[PDB]
Amino acid sequence: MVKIRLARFGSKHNPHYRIVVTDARRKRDGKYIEKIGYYDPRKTTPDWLKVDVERARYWLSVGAQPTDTARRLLRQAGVFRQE
Amino acid sequence: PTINQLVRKGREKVRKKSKVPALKGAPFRRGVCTVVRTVTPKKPNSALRKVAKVRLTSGYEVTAYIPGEGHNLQEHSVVLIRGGRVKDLLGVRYHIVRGVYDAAGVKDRKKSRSKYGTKKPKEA
Amino acid sequence: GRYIGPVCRLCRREGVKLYLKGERCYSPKCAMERRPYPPGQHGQKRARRPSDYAVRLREKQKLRRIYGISERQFRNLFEEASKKKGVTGSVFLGLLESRLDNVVYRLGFAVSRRQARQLVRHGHITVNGRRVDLPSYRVRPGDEIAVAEKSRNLELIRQNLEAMKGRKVGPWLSLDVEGMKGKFLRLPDREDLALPVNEQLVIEFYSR
Amino acid sequence: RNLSALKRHRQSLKRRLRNKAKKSAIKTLSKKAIQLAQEGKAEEALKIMRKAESLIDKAAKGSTLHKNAAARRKSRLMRKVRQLLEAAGAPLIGGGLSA
Amino acid sequence: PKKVLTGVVVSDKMQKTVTVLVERQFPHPLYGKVIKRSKKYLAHDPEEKYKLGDVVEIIESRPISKRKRFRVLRLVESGRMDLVEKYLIRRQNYESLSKRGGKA
Amino acid sequence: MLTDPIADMLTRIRNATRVYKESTDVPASRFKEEILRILAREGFIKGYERVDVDGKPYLRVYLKYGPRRQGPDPRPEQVIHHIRRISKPGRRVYVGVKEIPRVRRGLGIAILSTSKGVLTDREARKLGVGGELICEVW
RNA sequence: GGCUAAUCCCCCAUGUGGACCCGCCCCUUGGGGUGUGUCCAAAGGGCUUUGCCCGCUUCCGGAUGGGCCCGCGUCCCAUCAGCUAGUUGGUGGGGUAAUGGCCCACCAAGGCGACGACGGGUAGCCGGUCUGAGAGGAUGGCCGGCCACAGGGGCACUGAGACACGGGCCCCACUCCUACGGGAGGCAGCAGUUAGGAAUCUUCCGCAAUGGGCGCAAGCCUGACGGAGCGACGCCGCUUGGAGGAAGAAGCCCUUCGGGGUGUAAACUCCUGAACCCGGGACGAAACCCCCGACGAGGGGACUGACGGUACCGGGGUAAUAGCGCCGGCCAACUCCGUGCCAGCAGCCGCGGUAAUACGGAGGGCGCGAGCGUUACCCGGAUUCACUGGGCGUAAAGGGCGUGUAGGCGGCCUGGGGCGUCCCAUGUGAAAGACCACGGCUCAACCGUGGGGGAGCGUGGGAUACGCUCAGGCUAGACG
Ligand SMILES: [Mg+2]
Ligand SMILES: [Mg+2]
Ligand SMILES: [Mg+2]
Ligand SMILES: [Mg+2]
Ligand SMILES: [Mg+2]
Ligand SMILES: [Mg+2]
Ligand SMILES: [Mg+2]
Ligand SMILES: [Mg+2]
Ligand SMILES: [Mg+2]
Ligand SMILES: [Mg+2]
Ligand SMILES: [Mg+2]
Ligand SMILES: [Mg+2]
Ligand SMILES: [Mg+2]
Ligand SMILES: [Mg+2]
Ligand SMILES: [Mg+2]
Ligand SMILES: [Mg+2]
Ligand SMILES: [Mg+2]
Ligand SMILES: [Mg+2]
Ligand SMILES: [Mg+2]
Ligand SMILES: [Mg+2]
Ligand SMILES: [Mg+2]
Ligand SMILES: [Mg+2]
Ligand SMILES: [Mg+2]
Ligand SMILES: [Mg+2]
Ligand SMILES: [Mg+2]
Ligand SMILES: [Mg+2]
Ligand SMILES: [Mg+2]
Ligand SMILES: [Mg+2]
Ligand SMILES: [Mg+2]
Ligand SMILES: [Mg+2]
Ligand SMILES: [Mg+2]
Ligand SMILES: [Mg+2]
Ligand SMILES: [Mg+2]
Ligand SMILES: [Mg+2]
Ligand SMILES: [Mg+2]
Ligand SMILES: [Mg+2]
Ligand SMILES: [Mg+2]
Ligand SMILES: [Mg+2]
Ligand SMILES: [Mg+2]
Ligand SMILES: [Mg+2]
Ligand SMILES: [Mg+2]
Ligand SMILES: [Mg+2]
Ligand SMILES: [Mg+2]
Ligand SMILES: [Mg+2]
Ligand SMILES: [Mg+2]
Ligand SMILES: [Mg+2]
Ligand SMILES: [Mg+2]
Ligand SMILES: [Mg+2]
Ligand SMILES: [Mg+2]
Ligand SMILES: [Mg+2]
Ligand SMILES: [Mg+2]
Ligand SMILES: [Mg+2]
Ligand SMILES: [Mg+2]
Ligand SMILES: [Mg+2]
Ligand SMILES: [Mg+2]
Ligand SMILES: [Mg+2]
Ligand SMILES: [Mg+2]
Ligand SMILES: [Mg+2]
Ligand SMILES: [Mg+2]
Ligand SMILES: [Mg+2]
Ligand SMILES: [Mg+2]
Ligand SMILES: [Mg+2]
Ligand SMILES: [Mg+2]
Ligand SMILES: [Mg+2]
Ligand SMILES: [Mg+2]
Ligand SMILES: [Mg+2]
Ligand SMILES: [Mg+2]
Ligand SMILES: [Mg+2]
Ligand SMILES: [Mg+2]
Ligand SMILES: [Mg+2]
Ligand SMILES: [Mg+2]
Ligand SMILES: [Mg+2]
Ligand SMILES: [Mg+2]
Ligand SMILES: [Mg+2]
Ligand SMILES: [Mg+2]
Ligand SMILES: [Mg+2]
Ligand SMILES: [Mg+2]
Ligand SMILES: [Mg+2]
Ligand SMILES: [Mg+2]
Ligand SMILES: [Mg+2]
Ligand SMILES: [Mg+2]
Ligand SMILES: [Mg+2]
Ligand SMILES: [Mg+2]
Ligand SMILES: [Mg+2]
Ligand SMILES: [Mg+2]
Ligand SMILES: [Mg+2]
Ligand SMILES: [Mg+2]
Ligand SMILES: [Mg+2]
Ligand SMILES: [Mg+2]
Ligand SMILES: [Mg+2]
Ligand SMILES: [Mg+2]
Ligand SMILES: [Mg+2]
Ligand SMILES: [Mg+2]
Ligand SMILES: [Mg+2]
Ligand SMILES: [Mg+2]
Ligand SMILES: [Mg+2]
Ligand SMILES: [Mg+2]
Ligand SMILES: [Mg+2]
Ligand SMILES: [Mg+2]
Ligand SMILES: [Mg+2]
Ligand SMILES: [Mg+2]
Ligand SMILES: [Mg+2]
Ligand SMILES: [Mg+2]
Ligand SMILES: [Mg+2]
Ligand SMILES: [Mg+2]
Ligand SMILES: [Mg+2]
Ligand SMILES: [Mg+2]
Ligand SMILES: [Mg+2]
Ligand SMILES: [Mg+2]
Ligand SMILES: [Mg+2]
Ligand SMILES: [Mg+2]
Ligand SMILES: [Mg+2]
Ligand SMILES: [Mg+2]
Ligand SMILES: [Mg+2]
Ligand SMILES: [Mg+2]
Ligand SMILES: [Mg+2]
Ligand SMILES: [Mg+2]
Ligand SMILES: [Mg+2]
Ligand SMILES: [Zn+2]
């Protein structure tokens, strides 16, 4: 079951996640399907979050399942807003 | 050789023989002395050159040189063998490492002491 | 620990004033006046024709001892210059002269480069409003270098700046002595520096 | 010691039993049917063949047979039965076969 | 695309099968010259319509036997017994590669 | 027979110029002519002309040298210092356009044969095509 | 041996749909539609039970993950030259999700090999990595992708998936228990022990973060993982002070006894203030959940930190580790003394039998500096296997000579084809790495974001000089 989730990237005490579409069975930092975004929790730059929503929407549409935190980010980026 | 010939035959890569069967090339090898003997060098040199026959952890019996001014080796002494040859002695392919195992560092050695394996004096 | 042992002896080996002491090294004490030859027993014996290697070596050493930088740093910095688009010699000089400690010397906050290194390391120096204690920090054009406000009252800072009244800094720099701040306007290029170094020789020294 | 799903093993045995049994059923029936078609016995040949078909599909229902497994078995069955009937012919009950 | 290859039929001798000899050219990866190499493919000939000497097209197919992966797509030109002959002579040349020799 | 007519011609020219002949005769082929035409446009030769010799066609190539010289050895600088085959039967050489050699910092030339015709490296680059690398000349 | 529940197992029904045989149609390998016959469904639970939630069944499609197949590429020995009976193919079966000699019956007699079959040796492959001007050589640790394995050998079972590391059966070796009948076990998981070795860590912390499994959820599990510890193993950053301070102390060294050197070095003066003490003290954490809405969207609100009282900030504050190799040439740095072919040094040439800049100490000097050396191994230099880029009269190297097979190579002119060759477009060339730009940790190492590049291969289009090919012609080669 294909997922949308975080993969850990920056160095020690420097977490940077790629927001990622991948089969759930994969190791988290291993080969993913597509990268639809990125997240820096320490907000060290003016843009600490980016998400490509036309693509996030695609993957949701075909049945990708977000992690709660993935979901959280996507919502922040308005993937979910219907107005 | 014609290009056709190179195509049919090709160059031969040139393999390199090893100067040191310390077996699996290891930087060093442990062994025990069989003989501690002195031996006499070749033509334009005269000396009593200090040497030790070692049985090795490799399953090899080799001949080693015992560098430095004087040595504590003898008989069943355990020892570390480092490779590199004494030129003017036939068949000595390796050196013994002073300061490791049963071979002590050279007594009263002020200049380069890391070779010869001796520690730093206190200035008196 | 990059160098830190007697200096005017290097002034003496390289056969040129290296200005490692600030004051003194101007007056008639520098030991270049008063016996300008190599140190040690044989310094006054007749010199022998230097190998190409010896030439290149000593040129490199000269340039390095000038900045007080280590060899590891010197070399990395050089490899950097060689990689960058544009003439390695010039670029290398610019990268060197771009060090924070160096800039603090050039600006006259510190009398020497060693003193500048200390001034920086003890954080009496601020880059762009923020403290910087690392001597190897690279000052980019536009950056403003100043003395941190709490350290503005230090006897040596007051002094050094007082003697900076009516003196001009390099053309790639500008100094306001009243606010104790500089600015690094441009990368200096070989002709801005009077350095007694043929850098072609240095380039040729690593070409080996 | 004692990692507690050897429960899985036990179950595996039970299922092994069920599957084995269903399979046996299917095979013995299939042979019965074909062997009947051999004899131009077509009425009860197709009768049995029909039972067999059912058993096969019913197997496919769970993990015993599952999908193309059954489909293949059914095909080979019907092919053999019809092939045997003609060569003496007369598809009496014509139960399972398209006309 | 299912690969198509072109070859000469060097073997009649099986049932419903022909052996198709297929040349290939390419620059040597180092020495640069154009070298010519070749491979025999067993191909499916169900109607046994393809004869010795035929130049045919061979098409990548669903596996048929162990080592039959191709079918015969079409005939290109009928009979070239020169190509066959070359093959045969090369084979016969093996006769003396070993402990001694016969005629050249 | 003659295994490499192009090499043969290049060599006839070399050989002839090294003794300072005014001209040499190469046997005639259209391809040879196209090569000559490049040379003669490029200044390496005075030119050439079709010529019959014992009833057979040839290309008479008119050689060109420098001023006479001083000191011992008055012999002139050659206009063709170097003329050399690259692609030969037995190793053929094809460059893509990104791989067209630049001969002697542009003071020399390479001559490619392309599907747009026989070109110099400059011509070929401007024309945006590669080809067989025939010879280099400087 | 006995009782018993269910989302456990079975029987009939309903047949949306689907499976199979036969026919028909379109399509073309077993794809899609259709007709008749036969065959096939389900499971219930929770709630505020009057309607929602959690599920169940059949089917079609999607998404992801995989199986199988083909072209091409992928080390040494030819002192391995012939290999092969399921062998190679056919018909028919069997088996499987599925093609297949995968397996079996029968039939044919084939299949492979000098373009290196068969045999032997070594070896996980790759992105990449090291080196190199490049071509090339070498490598494949960590990170990512694939394969394979789980004491050795076989085998299946259960499943969507395994022929399953912490599942099962059997044989073998080993360890342990043993009432001698018989049993137990499998760290190539995290730590840790032991052995071998020149040599390779803590039986630590945490579920806070990211990820995973089950659960309606609350929540539970997770030696994945986030961390900390140990080791200069690597890289990067940093300290051992800074300014002054004698024609220049003492000591030690050299001396032509006039002096020269260590040396602004020290002492000393003054300034700064690593360490250290005090105070404050993190980001990484907003979702899951609560509120309004409609358990949505939207809005709003609260809980949670192993690392850690850590990083960091503020105040205070002491001049406070330096070593290692070398100084005959290559190769940067020279003198004194001791030794006398000894003791020794040594990478190569070499040095040492009385002046030793080559041994040993000292003074001095050169190089690097929390390192400096040594050994091992890879590339380099080595254009010393020569594609780039070498050679064979006498240095190694023309086969004793021919005939010719395979193969390699091929004159002039014209035409068709467009395989080589060249050009355009497109797809692919993951991520990481490399390159460039901008950025985040005070810098950097490290990291983030973006951009560019890229051989090769697929597909479409185009060019025709050269090479190929087919067709025709010529006569300068060749033969007559
Ligand atoms: Mg997976
Ligand atoms: Mg935002
Ligand atoms: Mg949506
Ligand atoms: Mg001697
Ligand atoms: Mg440069
Ligand atoms: Mg300027
Ligand atoms: Mg200066
Ligand atoms: Mg269990
Ligand atoms: Mg259970
Ligand atoms: Mg039975
Ligand atoms: Mg089938
Ligand atoms: Mg052909
Ligand atoms: Mg036949
Ligand atoms: Mg078959
Ligand atoms: Mg066909
Ligand atoms: Mg044979
Ligand atoms: Mg024989
Ligand atoms: Mg003439
Ligand atoms: Mg003309
Ligand atoms: Mg020439
Ligand atoms: Mg070439
Ligand atoms: Mg190409
Ligand atoms: Mg250039
Ligand atoms: Mg019972
Ligand atoms: Mg009952
Ligand atoms: Mg219906
Ligand atoms: Mg029913
Ligand atoms: Mg059920
Ligand atoms: Mg029921
Ligand atoms: Mg209910
Ligand atoms: Mg797929
Ligand atoms: Mg057999
Ligand atoms: Mg058989
Ligand atoms: Mg079959
Ligand atoms: Mg077989
Ligand atoms: Mg072949
Ligand atoms: Mg083999
Ligand atoms: Mg192996
Ligand atoms: Mg290997
Ligand atoms: Mg490199
Ligand atoms: Mg390089
Ligand atoms: Mg090489
Ligand atoms: Mg390379
Ligand atoms: Mg490899
Ligand atoms: Mg490992
Ligand atoms: Mg790995
Ligand atoms: Mg195994
Ligand atoms: Mg084991
Ligand atoms: Mg065993
Ligand atoms: Mg086993
Ligand atoms: Mg399951
Ligand atoms: Mg099953
Ligand atoms: Mg298991
Ligand atoms: Mg097992
Ligand atoms: Mg396995
Ligand atoms: Mg285990
Ligand atoms: Mg398991
Ligand atoms: Mg058991
Ligand atoms: Mg066991
Ligand atoms: Mg363990
Ligand atoms: Mg245990
Ligand atoms: Mg041990
Ligand atoms: Mg560890
Ligand atoms: Mg714990
Ligand atoms: Mg968690
Ligand atoms: Mg989770
Ligand atoms: Mg547990
Ligand atoms: Mg860990
Ligand atoms: Mg001082
Ligand atoms: Mg004194
Ligand atoms: Mg001293
Ligand atoms: Mg004195
Ligand atoms: Mg104070
Ligand atoms: Mg927090
Ligand atoms: Mg917070
Ligand atoms: Mg939680
Ligand atoms: Mg509510
Ligand atoms: Mg909300
Ligand atoms: Mg402080
Ligand atoms: Mg203070
Ligand atoms: Mg002190
Ligand atoms: Mg010498
Ligand atoms: Mg050197
Ligand atoms: Mg020298
Ligand atoms: Mg003596
Ligand atoms: Mg020495
Ligand atoms: Mg050595
Ligand atoms: Mg004496
Ligand atoms: Mg003496
Ligand atoms: Mg002497
Ligand atoms: Mg000496
Ligand atoms: Mg020496
Ligand atoms: Mg000495
Ligand atoms: Mg360091
Ligand atoms: Mg080498
Ligand atoms: Mg080099
Ligand atoms: Mg080279
Ligand atoms: Mg050699
Ligand atoms: Mg060559
Ligand atoms: Mg040579
Ligand atoms: Mg001779
Ligand atoms: Mg000879
Ligand atoms: Mg001869
Ligand atoms: Mg002979
Ligand atoms: Mg002949
Ligand atoms: Mg021939
Ligand atoms: Mg030919
Ligand atoms: Mg021709
Ligand atoms: Mg044509
Ligand atoms: Mg083409
Ligand atoms: Mg890439
Ligand atoms: Mg920055
Ligand atoms: Mg590449
Ligand atoms: Mg392409
Ligand atoms: Mg194309
Ligand atoms: Mg045309
Ligand atoms: Mg003709
Ligand atoms: Mg005649
Ligand atoms: Zn000075």
Backbone angles phi, psi at E7, to 5 degrees: -155, 170
Intra-chain end-to-end CA distance of chain A, in Å: 29
CB B97 within 8 A of CB B103: yes
CATH numbers and ranges of domains, chain C:
1-96+194-208 (1.10.1050.10), 97-193 (3.10.290.10)
Backbone angles phi, psi at E92, to 5 degrees: -65, -25
Q: Does B4 touch chain E (CB under 8 A)?
A: yes
Per the DSSP assignment, residues forming a β-bridge with A20 are A5, A35
What kind of experiment solved this structure?
X-ray
Backbone angles phi, psi at D74, to 5 degrees: -60, -45
- Tokens linked to C6: 């007697």
Half-sphere exposure of F35 (CA within 13 A, CB side): 28
The domain spans of chain F are 3-80, 81-138
Rounded to an integer, what distance in angstroms lies between the CA atom of residue D52 and that of residue D40?
A: 18
Give Cβ neighbours of residue E67 (< 8 Å, ≥ 6 apart).
E42
Distance C177 CA to ligand 108 centre (A): 85
Quick one: three-class SS letters along chain C?
Answer: CCCCCCCHHHHHHCCCCCCCCCCCCCCCCCCCCCCCCCCCHHHHCCCCCCCHHHHHHHHHHHHHHHHCCCHHHHHHHHHHHHHCCCCHHHHHHHHHHCEHHHHHHHHCCCCCHHHHHHHHHCCCEEECCEECCCCCCECCCCCCEEECHHHCCCHHHHHHHHCCCCCCCCCCEEEECCCCEEEECCCCCHHHCCCCCCHHHHHHHHCC
CB D45 within 8 A of CB D37: yes
Quick one: three-class SS letters along chain E?
Answer: CCCEEEEEEEECCCCCEEEEEEEEEEECCCCCCEEEEEEEEEEECCCCCCCCCCEEEEEEEEEEECCEEEEEEEEEECCCHHHHHHHHHHHHHHHHCCCCCCCC
Task: For residue F91, list chain B residues with Cβ-Cβ distance below 8 A.
Answer: 3
Rounded to an integer, what distance in angstroms lies between the CA atom of residue C72 and that of residue C94?
A: 18
Distance from residue F94 (CA) to nucleotide G136 (C1'), in Å? 21
Intra-chain end-to-end CA distance of chain F, in Å: 29
Half-sphere exposure of C204 (CA within 13 A, CB side): 13
Task: Tell me the nt nearest to B44, Cα to C1'.
Answer: G341
Best to test chain B binding among E25, E26, E33, E36 (most B CBs inside 10 Å): E33
Q: Which residue's alpha carbon is at the shortest distance from the C1' of G255?
A: C41
Nearest chain B Cα to F92, which residue? Answer: B3
- Tokens linked to B83: 């490779």
Which CATH number does F81-138 carry?
Answer: 3.30.1490.10
- In our burial notation (b when 16+ CB lie closer than 10 A, e otherwise), range F85-110 reads bbbbeebebbbeeeebeebeeeebbb
Backbone angles phi, psi at B2, to 5 degrees: -60, 160
Q: How far is CA C141 from the centre of its chain?
A: 18
Helix axis angle for C71-83 and C52-67, nearest 10°, is 100
Nucleotides on strand G lying under 7 Å from protein C-beta? 9-12, 18-23, 29, 35-42, 58, 62-65, 68-74, 77, 81-82, 88-91, 93-102, 107-115, 136-138, 143-146, 157-161, 164, 166-168, 196-199, 209-213, 224-228, 236-248, 253-254, 260-265, 270-274, 283-288, 296-298, 313-315, 319, 321-326, 330-335, 341-352, 360-379, 384-387, 390-392, 403-414, 419-424, 430, 435-437, 439-443, 446-450, 458-459, 462-467, 476-477
- Tokens linked to E2: 């299912």
Residue F114, SS3 per DSSP = strand
CATH numbers and ranges of domains, chain D:
1-99 (1.20.58.110)
- In our burial notation (b when 16+ CB lie closer than 10 A, e otherwise), range C163-176 reads ebeeeebbebbebe
Distance C125 CA to ligand 81 centre (A): 25
DSSP state of A22: E
Half-sphere exposure of E3 (CA within 13 A, CB side): 7
Give the type of residue at F108: G
CATH numbers and ranges of domains, chain E:
1-104 (2.40.50.140)
Nearest to C10 by CA among C114, C104, C116: C114
CB D96 within 8 A of CB D50: yes
Burial-class residue C53 by CB neighbours within 10 Å (0-12, 13-18, 19+): exposed
Q: How far is CA E6 from the centre of its chain?
A: 9
Chains E and B contact (Cβ–Cβ under 8 Å for 3 or more pairs): yes
The domain spans of chain A are 1-83
DSSP assignment of D44-75 equals HHHHHHHHHHHHHHHHHHTTSS-THHHHHHHH
Count of residues in chain A: 83
User: Would you tell me which residues 49-78 of chain E have a C-beta closer than 8 angstroms to some C-beta of chain B?
Assistant: none
Which CATH number does A1-83 carry?
Answer: 3.30.1320.10
Nearest to F13 by CA among F36, F42, F43, F31: F36
- Tokens linked to B23: 């077996």
Rounded to an integer, what distance in angstroms lies between the CA atom of residue C177 and that of residue C163?
A: 10
Rounded to an integer, what distance in angstroms lies between the CA atom of residue C22 and that of residue C109?
A: 12
CA-based max dimension of chain F:
49
Matching residue, tokens 């003196």:
C167
CATH numbers and ranges of domains, chain B:
1-124 (2.40.50.140)
Helix axis angle for C199-206 and C88-97, nearest 10°, is 100
Per the DSSP assignment, residues forming a β-bridge with E57 are E6, E74
Which CATH number does F3-80 carry?
Answer: 3.30.1370.30
